[PDB]
Amino acid sequence: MTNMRKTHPLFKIINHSFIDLPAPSNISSWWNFGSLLGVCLMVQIITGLFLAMHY
Amino acid sequence: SSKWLDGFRKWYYNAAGFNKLGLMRDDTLHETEDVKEAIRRLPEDLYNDRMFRIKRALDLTMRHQILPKDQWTKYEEDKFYLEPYLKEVIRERKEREEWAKK
Amino acid sequence: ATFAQALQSVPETQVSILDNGLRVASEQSSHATCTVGVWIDAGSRYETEKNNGAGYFLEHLAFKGTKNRPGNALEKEVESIGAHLNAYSTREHTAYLIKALSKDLPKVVELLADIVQNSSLEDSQIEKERDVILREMQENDASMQNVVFDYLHATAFQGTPLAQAVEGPSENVRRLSRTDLTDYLNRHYKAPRMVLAAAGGVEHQQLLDLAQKHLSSVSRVYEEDAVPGLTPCRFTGSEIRHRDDALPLAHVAIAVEGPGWANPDNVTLQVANAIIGHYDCTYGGGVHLSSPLASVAVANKLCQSFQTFNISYSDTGLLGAHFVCDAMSIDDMVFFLQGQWMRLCTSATESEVTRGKNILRNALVSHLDGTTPVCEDIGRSLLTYGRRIPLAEWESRIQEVDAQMLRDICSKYFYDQCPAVAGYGPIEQLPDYNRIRSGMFWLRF
Amino acid sequence: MLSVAARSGPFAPVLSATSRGVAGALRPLLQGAVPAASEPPVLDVKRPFLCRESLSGQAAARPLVATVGLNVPASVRF
Amino acid sequence: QPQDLEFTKLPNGLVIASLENYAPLSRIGLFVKAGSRYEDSNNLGTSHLLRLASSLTTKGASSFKITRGIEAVGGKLSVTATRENMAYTVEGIRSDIEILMEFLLNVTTAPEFRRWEVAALRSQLKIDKAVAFQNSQTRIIENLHDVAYKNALANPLYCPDYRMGKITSEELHYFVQNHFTSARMALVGLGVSHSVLKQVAEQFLNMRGGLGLAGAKAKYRGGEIREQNGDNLVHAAIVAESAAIGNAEANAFSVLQHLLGAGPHIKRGNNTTSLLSQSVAKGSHQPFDVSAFNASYSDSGLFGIYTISQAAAAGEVINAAYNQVKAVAQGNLSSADVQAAKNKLKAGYLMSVETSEGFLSEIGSQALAAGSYMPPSTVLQQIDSVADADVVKAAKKFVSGKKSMAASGNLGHTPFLDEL
Ligand code: HEM
């Protein structure tokens, strides 16, 4: 057997980025903000797609 | 009709086309896990001969050429060198599978 | 000649009780050599952090002279007859044993009687084995397995008398004196917490006559008139990690709470450990080991070694695994180990259950080969269970274990539990407690 | 004839070792290279014996006997 | 119920010894006279690889089948090797002992020794040597046997570093066909009847001649070796010739070994009855250990002093031990201490055979060395017949003999053989 999270060629990127990424323990709430930006970005895209469906 | 089948086998061997590249029949096998284990158990002289034959075949296919007709792999001298190693690998894998069944 | 009447042909352990409360048990065999030992229910669990190294320092002082054989003289009469004298102490037991011939039975009973009764202590000897135990502890700091198991006992039994080690801290062995040792002897060396076990060419009548002649007076009265009890210990899901990157290898032990000495389910848990097994780098097997964890560890070159353990104490215990490996493998090894545990909670089939039953049968019978492990089994069984369990009873208890109750017991003790983790060495890739805690359950199940 | 290295004729660079901190203009003969060799395996450290009681029993008294088990760790007795 | 020990020699020299004690688990071992002493310089370290090659594919059972069958029933398989002979021991339930015998005899009699298997096994060979050399007693004993003999006993147990990656399977087949012959093996069984042992012996074992290769008589060399490796403790072994197995002086050498001290009897004691430890501790104040090293073979033997001392105090410990043995050799000894040494030797011999594995090892060793079984009471009464003059003679033979020294550690203060 093997570890599917670390050996799959697609899941290795998600494991290296958002699962087993080493991060500082003492970062404050401001370090949330950029991730929120990414979420807000895709939110815009989703809403924009539906605003592209009737404009 | 044994000689009809045998001559048809010679015709199919000449019509497959890998004898014109200098290749043996055991070189043309697809390298799955059992076949890779069969190459891993080979003696080093046979391994080097096989690797040179694959390199020569790839070089011939690159230039879209073939060997001269006297350098073609004849049917009688085509040695089935990988057959006992592959046979042992299949036997061991089937033994492991039948142990895992029970 | 089947296995059942072969196990029935084992001689019965003969147990009698003297008038003071001392247990006397014997196992008659055909050997010309015998093993006689004294087991006392007194360890580091019976200490109140002011005499935390009392048992270790007392067993250091036990073979240094008595009130009847001062100095090394008793040593002469245990070395002029060829007898080998040994002693040990765990967190809840103490043993003083002599292996000798069958002809020297009254003398070894006399030495075992007066060692545990009239041990002479003098201040020069107090300071001599004070510095000796300081050097012993300095030596034992370099054995990483002992350090990791002491860490596991410290973090799994926090605030309880099971966290403190047998040796104790260095401040106690620098501050223990004669009066506290005398108090420990008066409080713990009593007949209802004492078993005299014999194995080999020993008749029960001669052993009983010598025990009545020598061990009749043990001062079994409670002098202080205060009851010494055994409160239950609180298991703590926690982790201790000792980061030190200069060590070449990392030792990690992960364990959950055990059921205890008197729980029958321990037997089932033994079978579970026999499914997981153990592996060392010098094993001659290779890839074709039956245990999936050992096979994947030798296929991926993960661990130097691993071993499972089920340590038992009164109502409690530590059931888990210990592996030494390099740093770069640690997390991967943890993952595989956790998967094996969850496999036993979910997908235990009858083939590996039968294999674990056979392994437990062979190990639990062939462990009792010789007078010393038989005597140890008699002493520990009379101290823990209150009786010596016959080997056919162990066979009948192993036989009832099938896959359904094994996965039931494994889901009871391993599934969705909070473990205790102790790490020592380059343990950076050893994860947080949250990933190990998340590894104790499957989302697919 | 002093200068021992030059007194020994054929064994001149065997009895004396010459190195440099700054390379010369003349290129040395037999430049030489370390091949990539194997590495010893990493084993856990053992208990030291810094007291007289721990050294008791560590001295050999019997012929040396090795034992290799299949699922038993390999052991040795002195 | 153990009525006797059934001892039989077949006409081709194969020995079968069986004892029926109705034990819950049976133990069956094949003892082959094929130790590390039977290699010349052209196949050194072959016995190490042949010890490690027990789990390879054999003609009758694959390696996967061998491992899964030996541990599916809960049984165990081990190989125990010294310089002289090797032992292949299987152990398991009385019910499942027949397939264990088939697996053991397939391993021993007909190995296939495939090339890729030993190619994968050389790494385990290196790992096992590096694990076993973690004890400095192992390296000292290996160097002591290397210096003490010219040939036929100086071959190491463990494979040398140059031989790793160069041991072929053809040398293993050569070793098996030349040393696993019929009249050099004893099949010993505990918990198993004699008739099935004879059936297995006539079935699996009767295709070998019996003699093979003889040996090279193990001539004595002498000398010293010193290994500056920078340890906290200095290990020094000073040895000389002694009696072989079967002589009247080997028992006297064992009595002398237990008289001078051959191991502790008390945990964290002081060894008051040991002459060497008392003589060294008369003038010393640092941690140490002195014991008497004894080893007996079929043709030669070794007896001497083993000392673990400090780096700056090695000379005092070595000189104190040597002066104590020189005092013993001049008749300065007590007959009561000789009686204590005899009691210690009898106790150690009786405790070495109480376990089933020690009993099987002693039966196999006696069957290989002499071809007949010796009851333990006869061994005890042979111990009792040793005179004190024999002990004085053995000490005098050690003092007057040529020496071999193996030293390891910080050897700035460790003395030399001519400086003794
Ligand atoms: C690809 C993704 C996007 C699409 C398809 C999209 C599409 C549209 C459409 C169709 C409108 C006109 C609808 C209306 O406002 O009545 C609009 C308006 C607008 N969009 Fe986007 N948009 C996208 C992403 C974004 C992003 C990333 C931003 C910046 C955060 C953005 C900012 C705006 C703003 C400010 C307006 C004007 C809203 C208003 O009327 O006040 N859009 N978008």
Side-chain angles (χ1 to χ4, degrees):
Chain A
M1 64 184 73
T2 176
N3 202 348
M4 211 65 168
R5 177 166 43 87
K6 322 184 73 75
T7 58
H8 194 257
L10 188 153
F11 293 148
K12 208 192 307 160
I13 307 175
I14 297 89
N15 177 48
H16 187 273
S17 312
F18 307 119
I19 311 175
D20 284 10
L21 168 78
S25 64
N26 69 313
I27 54 175
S28 55
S29 61
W30 305 93
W31 274 256
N32 290 34
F33 264 117
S35 89
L36 303 193
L37 268 170
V39 169
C40 202
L41 180 83
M42 74 189 66
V43 163
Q44 275 312 296
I45 284 168
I46 287 177
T47 59
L49 199 57
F50 283 78
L51 271 297
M53 271 185 238
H54 302 87
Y55 172 76
Chain B
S1 281
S2 173
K3 68 97 175 179
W4 286 261
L5 178 62
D6 288 329
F8 182 76
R9 268 201 219 263
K10 271 86 75 177
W11 168 85
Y12 176 75
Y13 174 74
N14 270 297
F18 61 93
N19 61 331
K20 313 183 176 194
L21 303 169
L23 288 173
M24 315 264 277
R25 195 206 74 200
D26 287 345
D27 307 342
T28 55
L29 289 152
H30 178 35
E31 303 206 15
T32 182
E33 284 321 290
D34 291 331
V35 175
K36 277 178 103 65
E37 193 39 57
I39 317 294
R40 195 140 40 240
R41 296 183 188 191
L42 265 166
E44 205 66 34
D45 62 62
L46 287 182
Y47 180 76
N48 289 342
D49 291 331
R50 163 172 192 281
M51 288 288 293
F52 177 60
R53 275 189 301 254
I54 307 284
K55 190 161 171 37
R56 183 167 59 163
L58 290 173
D59 179 87
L60 284 164
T61 305
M62 151 167 54
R63 307 179 269 116
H64 301 298
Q65 320 270 9
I66 48 161
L67 285 185
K69 204 190 165 68
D70 72 80
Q71 301 184 355
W72 288 0
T73 311
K74 306 307 193 207
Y75 187 48
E76 282 82 16
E77 51 166 40
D78 184 340
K79 302 301 191 284
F80 296 155
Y81 63 71
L82 211 58
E83 269 186 352
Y85 309 105
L86 183 71
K87 168 195 307 167
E88 281 256 0
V89 163
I90 296 321
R91 260 197 65 248
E92 287 169 5
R93 191 191 45 84
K94 280 180 67 144
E95 185 189 28
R96 279 193 273 102
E97 166 192 331
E98 207 161 354
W99 199 281
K101 280 174 199 168
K102 75 174 60 55
Chain C
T2 61
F3 198 42
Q5 75 252 29
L7 290 191
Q8 205 69 261
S9 76
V10 182
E12 185 185 346
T13 308
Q14 197 145 349
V15 176
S16 61
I17 307 164
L18 268 168
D19 293 6
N20 45 13
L22 169 75
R23 262 82 54 84
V24 167
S26 70
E27 182 65 26
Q28 170 80 64
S29 170
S30 55
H31 290 153
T33 48
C34 80
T35 296
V36 186
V38 176
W39 267 261
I40 312 151
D41 207 345
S44 83
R45 205 183 167 177
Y46 282 122
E47 292 161 349
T48 73
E49 68 273 15
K50 274 77 71 178
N51 63 6
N52 207 5
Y56 205 54
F57 183 76
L58 273 182
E59 66 182 1
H60 267 69
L61 291 159
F63 307 139
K64 298 297 146 68
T66 52
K67 321 287 216 308
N68 300 301
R69 296 155 175 93
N72 74 49
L74 73 165
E75 154 165 356
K76 284 174 56 55
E77 69 178 2
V78 75
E79 273 195 343
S80 301
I81 68 166
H84 283 264
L85 177 45
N86 203 359
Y88 57 91
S89 53
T90 55
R91 278 179 179 83
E92 53 168 2
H93 294 119
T94 315
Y96 299 93
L97 59 89
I98 308 177
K99 41 169 51 183
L101 305 177
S102 172
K103 264 270 180 282
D104 308 338
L105 182 75
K107 299 289 94 176
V108 299
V109 172
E110 180 183 9
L111 311 193
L112 284 184
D114 78 325
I115 275 169
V116 306
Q117 280 185 195
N118 312 126
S119 182
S120 183
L121 315 177
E122 48 193 6
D123 46 353
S124 58
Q125 213 63 47
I126 296 300
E127 51 94 20
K128 273 194 282 290
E129 291 82 3
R130 158 171 297 118
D131 66 77
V132 160
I133 291 173
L134 278 170
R135 283 199 308 242
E136 285 288 329
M137 282 206 262
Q138 193 176 354
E139 278 164 355
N140 275 328
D141 291 331
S143 188
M144 290 185 65
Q145 182 187 350
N146 294 150
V147 174
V148 164
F149 270 64
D150 268 333
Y151 283 178
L152 187 70
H153 278 75
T155 196
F157 293 115
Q158 297 176 357
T160 62
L162 213 45
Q164 46 201 2
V166 187
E167 291 87 2
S170 67
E171 46 262 17
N172 285 318
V173 66
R174 272 190 285 259
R175 86 187 153 205
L176 263 290
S177 69
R178 174 68 186 273
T179 303
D180 286 327
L181 299 160
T182 313
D183 165 66
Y184 196 85
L185 289 173
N186 295 342
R187 263 175 57 86
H188 298 272
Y189 274 30
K190 304 210 169 313
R193 311 150 77 180
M194 260 170 67
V195 177
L196 175 63
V202 172
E203 283 284 339
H204 189 82
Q205 201 45 65
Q206 180 174 354
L207 185 84
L208 192 54
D209 291 331
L210 270 297
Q212 200 186 351
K213 183 171 73 175
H214 289 283
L215 285 165
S216 280
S217 57
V218 287
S219 80
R220 84 290 188 276
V221 188
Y222 277 179
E223 294 86 3
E224 296 179 348
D225 278 337
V227 183
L230 199 51
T231 71
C233 287
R234 173 199 55 195
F235 193 84
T236 297
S238 64
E239 60 158 341
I240 184 169
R241 67 180 65 251
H242 191 162
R243 178 85 171 274
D244 179 26
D245 273 318
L247 298 169
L249 288 172
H251 294 241
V252 172
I254 300 169
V256 302
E257 188 182 356
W261 275 119
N263 216 311
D265 312 339
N266 279 285
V267 182
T268 314
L269 290 173
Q270 289 294 108
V271 187
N273 289 329
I275 301 190
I276 310 162
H278 38 64
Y279 168 77
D280 194 68
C281 63
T282 53
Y283 272 22
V287 185
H288 313 294
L289 269 295
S290 281
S291 176
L293 182 51
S295 74
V296 73
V298 70
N300 290 328
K301 263 79 72 176
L302 287 161
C303 70
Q304 288 293 108
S305 72
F306 71 94
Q307 44 164 7
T308 55
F309 57 92
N310 188 14
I311 317 165
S312 302
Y313 308 101
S314 305
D315 170 340
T316 187
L318 280 170
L319 169 76
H322 178 91
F323 49 93
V324 61
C325 56
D326 66 320
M328 295 298 103
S329 300
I330 286 178
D331 190 10
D332 292 330
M333 171 85 204
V334 169
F335 161 72
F336 287 126
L337 166 69
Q338 271 170 150
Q340 287 317 292
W341 280 345
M342 292 316 122
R343 207 180 49 85
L344 294 175
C345 303
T346 300
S347 294
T349 70
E350 302 279 343
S351 183
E352 68 264 16
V353 162
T354 317
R355 188 186 86 231
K357 279 194 297 188
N358 296 326
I359 282 178
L360 187 62
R361 275 177 187 108
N362 287 43
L364 192 148
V365 171
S366 53
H367 165 58
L368 312 177
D369 201 77
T371 55
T372 315
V374 162
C375 190
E376 284 171 340
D377 178 40
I378 289 156
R380 186 152 25 76
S381 307
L382 264 73
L383 271 194
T384 48
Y385 313 109
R387 70 191 175 88
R388 168 94 193 278
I389 293 178
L391 198 54
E393 185 162 337
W394 288 119
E395 180 42 42
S396 69
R397 210 150 294 177
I398 284 168
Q399 177 82 265
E400 66 182 1
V401 183
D402 64 329
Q404 182 49 60
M405 65 179 288
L406 191 148
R407 66 181 154 259
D408 279 335
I409 291 302
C410 279
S411 284
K412 179 178 170 56
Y413 289 119
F414 275 113
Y415 195 81
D416 210 8
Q417 305 293 316
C418 292
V421 182
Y424 190 28
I427 46 178
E428 185 170 1
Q429 184 177 2
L430 170 75
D432 62 357
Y433 196 81
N434 270 306
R435 203 64 64 88
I436 309 169
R437 189 50 191 82
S438 309
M440 311 295 298
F441 74 103
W442 277 354
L443 291 162
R444 69 174 82 123
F445 176 64
Chain D
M1 293 177 70
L2 306 186
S3 165
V4 189
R7 183 185 256 281
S8 59
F11 308 100
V14 193
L15 281 147
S16 77
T18 314
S19 66
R20 73 213 61 161
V22 180
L26 294 174
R27 173 179 329 146
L29 211 63
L30 277 296
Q31 298 210 105
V34 176
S38 80
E39 290 287 326
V42 176
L43 273 299
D44 44 356
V45 298
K46 276 292 175 255
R47 275 192 198 83
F49 309 100
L50 61 84
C51 67
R52 208 206 40 87
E53 321 285 19
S54 71
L55 277 169
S56 196
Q58 275 290 310
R62 264 170 309 115
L64 171 84
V65 169
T67 300
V68 170
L70 192 83
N71 50 3
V72 186
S75 66
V76 70
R77 280 82 65 193
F78 315 130
Chain E
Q1 323 302 107
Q3 49 186 357
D4 56 338
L5 191 150
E6 311 215 8
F7 206 95
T8 315
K9 189 167 180 71
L10 274 194
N12 55 352
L14 161 71
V15 185
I16 294 93
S18 70
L19 197 146
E20 179 57 48
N21 55 341
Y22 303 75
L25 281 71
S26 307
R27 202 187 292 270
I28 292 167
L30 178 63
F31 288 80
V32 193
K33 216 191 301 179
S36 158
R37 76 165 292 154
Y38 295 102
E39 316 168 339
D40 61 331
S41 69
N42 288 319
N43 53 4
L44 283 171
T46 311
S47 52
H48 192 191
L49 195 63
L50 194 149
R51 181 171 65 245
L52 265 68
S54 71
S55 79
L56 295 195
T57 61
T58 55
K59 288 190 287 298
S62 67
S63 60
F64 175 78
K65 181 180 182 179
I66 279 168
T67 315
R68 294 292 176 106
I70 193 66
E71 77 192 348
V73 308
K76 272 174 171 54
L77 168 78
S78 71
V79 179
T80 289
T82 187
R83 277 173 179 85
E84 272 204 332
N85 45 6
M86 302 192 299
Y88 282 70
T89 308
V90 74
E91 190 276 331
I93 304 169
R94 287 216 71 179
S95 70
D96 295 296
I97 193 66
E98 192 72 34
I99 58 170
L100 298 201
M101 259 181 288
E102 281 136 30
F103 274 134
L104 176 66
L105 273 297
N106 261 305
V107 162
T108 52
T109 57
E112 195 154 355
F113 287 141
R114 300 173 176 183
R115 166 185 36 87
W116 45 95
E117 311 256 10
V118 296
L121 199 65
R122 285 152 179 169
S123 75
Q124 189 50 238
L125 188 80
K126 185 195 206 306
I127 288 167
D128 198 12
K129 190 211 190 179
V131 163
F133 268 40
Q134 212 156 6
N135 302 317
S136 64
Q137 288 94 22
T138 304
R139 196 181 279 101
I140 279 296
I141 282 177
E142 288 297 327
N143 292 318
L144 192 75
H145 281 93
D146 181 37
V147 170
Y149 296 100
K150 288 174 186 176
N151 79 6
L153 264 179
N155 319 321
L157 274 299
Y158 304 99
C159 170
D161 301 354
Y162 83 100
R163 284 289 285 159
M164 281 145 178
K166 271 149 63 173
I167 302 179
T168 65
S169 80
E170 274 79 18
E171 305 173 18
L172 268 76
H173 273 299
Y174 182 76
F175 202 83
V176 161
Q177 84 197 6
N178 277 315
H179 301 102
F180 276 60
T181 63
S182 180
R184 280 144 64 107
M185 325 195 294
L187 208 49
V188 172
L190 310 179
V192 54
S193 72
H194 199 78
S195 310
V196 298
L197 268 293
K198 208 171 295 296
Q199 282 166 356
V200 164
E202 63 90 20
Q203 182 191 16
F204 273 92
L205 291 169
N206 275 36
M207 71 304 297
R208 289 292 177 87
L211 274 299
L213 280 169
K217 209 49 185 174
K219 318 185 297 289
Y220 188 71
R221 171 170 157 212
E224 76 179 349
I225 188 74
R226 292 166 78 94
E227 294 290 347
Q228 182 63 254
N229 55 354
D231 265 332
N232 296 115
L233 303 160
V234 170
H235 297 257
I238 306 170
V239 75
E241 277 266 359
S242 74
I245 301 162
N247 315 120
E249 216 185 359
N251 307 119
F253 265 115
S254 301
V255 164
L256 170 66
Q257 184 214 3
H258 271 96
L259 164 70
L260 295 171
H265 295 266
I266 316 173
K267 165 163 273 167
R268 305 176 268 252
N270 279 320
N271 310 112
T272 314
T273 65
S274 173
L275 294 192
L276 288 178
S277 289
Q278 281 297 103
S279 62
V280 169
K282 175 172 91 203
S284 170
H285 62 67
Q286 280 175 349
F288 72 102
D289 195 291
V290 187
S291 70
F293 175 79
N294 188 39
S296 60
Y297 307 102
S298 67
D299 44 357
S300 188
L302 281 186
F303 180 76
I305 306 303
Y306 196 87
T307 53
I308 314 173
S309 45
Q310 295 292 136
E316 327 180 12
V317 172
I318 285 163
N319 280 322
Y322 203 83
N323 281 134
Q324 175 61 79
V325 180
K326 279 185 62 182
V328 173
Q330 297 208 3
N332 296 115
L333 82 173
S334 172
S335 290
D337 204 320
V338 186
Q339 193 55 242
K342 285 184 198 186
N343 283 130
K344 281 183 277 181
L345 180 61
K346 286 184 277 202
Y349 173 70
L350 280 183
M351 293 180 183
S352 64
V353 301
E354 47 180 336
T355 49
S356 78
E357 44 185 359
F359 193 43
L360 184 136
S361 177
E362 171 275 350
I363 288 164
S365 74
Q366 275 188 357
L368 276 189
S372 185
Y373 173 65
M374 192 161 182
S377 70
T378 51
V379 188
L380 296 198
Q381 79 165 355
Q382 197 186 11
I383 284 168
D384 289 7
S385 62
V386 172
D388 212 347
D390 299 336
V391 191
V392 176
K393 190 199 301 309
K396 192 164 292 294
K397 189 188 265 192
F398 166 69
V399 165
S400 57
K402 201 158 70 175
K403 299 288 194 297
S404 297
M405 182 146 177
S408 168
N410 188 19
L411 311 161
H413 292 270
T414 308
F416 292 83
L417 277 195
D418 46 351
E419 285 177 352
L420 288 177

